Amino acid sequence: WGYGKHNGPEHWHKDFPIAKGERQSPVDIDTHTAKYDPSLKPLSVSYDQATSLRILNNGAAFNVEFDDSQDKAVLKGGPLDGTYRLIQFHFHWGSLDGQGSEHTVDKKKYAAELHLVHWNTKYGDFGKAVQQPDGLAVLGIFLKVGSAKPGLQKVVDVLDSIKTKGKSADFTNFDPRGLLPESLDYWTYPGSLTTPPLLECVTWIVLKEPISVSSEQVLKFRKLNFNGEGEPEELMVDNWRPAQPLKNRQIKASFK
Ligand SMILES: [Hg+2]
Ligand SMILES: [Zn+2]
């Protein structure tokens, strides 16, 4: 599976029939159809004890991985029951600034999208959590191109050391608080992983406020490779799944 003509999102259903399921992600967020939900509790993003370990090119994106062996960086509140532990973050991005996000907002595509992936600690590990309908919570954050994001630059600067699939580097002492916008206003709906195996285990929390990154920052994302070392070079661009049918879902807003 991949993002090309012969193996991209329109082919995934053959190996992963849940691609045509009832709660697939991403979706278009129709802001006028979403409803404010007073039942939502305040969202709690507690990342001050986060322990990053490594950065990995997995051939689909690059993942910044965390030590999730203790409750050190967690998401709670909002639509969530219980505590969800941060395991990794990654991005999806475009070949041009006009596309790259997975979710869309009134059909608007952003240049990129950040996914902070968390698992529900009552299931003990990530692998058990993805067997559960409420196993995961993904915090999604849009990126637009304008001013640089200072807290992204450490990520940008290490990308040259993980150019190709299967390469990793030490990535300790990175603070993901530097990737968050001012506001935690959000939309939320039930969905799925956006790459194979496309499992329907995710409570999505998508922030309304994008972060701004510079053109030079996103240009460095686009210098990564989908291929392995010594293989013909295929730039890692347009690694996003388009919007999927909303089906029997409602999107709730935390803000009126
Ligand atoms: Hg699941
Ligand atoms: Zn993702």
Ligand nearest to the backbone CA of 130? 1
Q: Range of 224's domain?
A: 1-256
Task: Give the amino acid at 173.
Answer: N
What is the rounded distance in angstroms from the CA atom of residue 144 to the CA atom of residue 50?
25
What is the rounded distance in angstroms from the CA atom of residue 41 to the CA atom of residue 88?
24
Eight-state DSSP code of residue 225: B
C-alpha 108 to ligand 1 mean position (Å): 28
C-alpha 205 to ligand 1 mean position (Å): 17
How was this one solved? Answer: X-ray
Smallest CA-to-CA distance from 24 within 200, 242, 251 is with: 200
Smallest CA-to-CA distance from 158 within 55, 4, 69 is with: 55
What's the Cα-to-Cα distance from 117 to each of 65, 80, 135, 194, rounded to whole Å?
10, 14, 11, 12
C-alpha 199 to ligand 1 mean position (Å): 5
C-alpha 130 to ligand 1 mean position (Å): 5
What is the rounded distance in angstroms from the CA atom of residue 49 to the CA atom of residue 66?
11
Q: Looking at the 3D structure of the chain, how many domains does it have?
A: 1
Please report the resolution in angstroms: 1.0
| CATH code for position 97 | 3.10.200.10
C-alpha 193 to ligand 1 mean position (Å): 9
In Å, the largest CA–CA distance within the chain is: 54
Could you tell me if 26 and 205 are in contact, meaning their C-beta atoms sit under 8 angstroms apart?
Answer: no
C-alpha 132 to ligand 1 mean position (Å): 4
C-alpha 22 to ligand 1 mean position (Å): 12
Could you tell me if 238 and 9 are in contact, meaning their C-beta atoms sit under 8 angstroms apart?
Answer: no
C-alpha 239 to ligand 2 mean position (Å): 9
C-alpha 145 to ligand 2 mean position (Å): 19
What is the rounded distance in angstroms from the CA atom of residue 218 to the CA atom of residue 167?
20
C-alpha 140 to ligand 2 mean position (Å): 8
Question: SS3 for 189?
Answer: strand
Ligand nearest to the backbone CA of 93? 2
What is the rounded distance in angstroms from the CA atom of residue 238 to the CA atom of residue 60?
10
Ligand nearest to the backbone CA of 114? 2
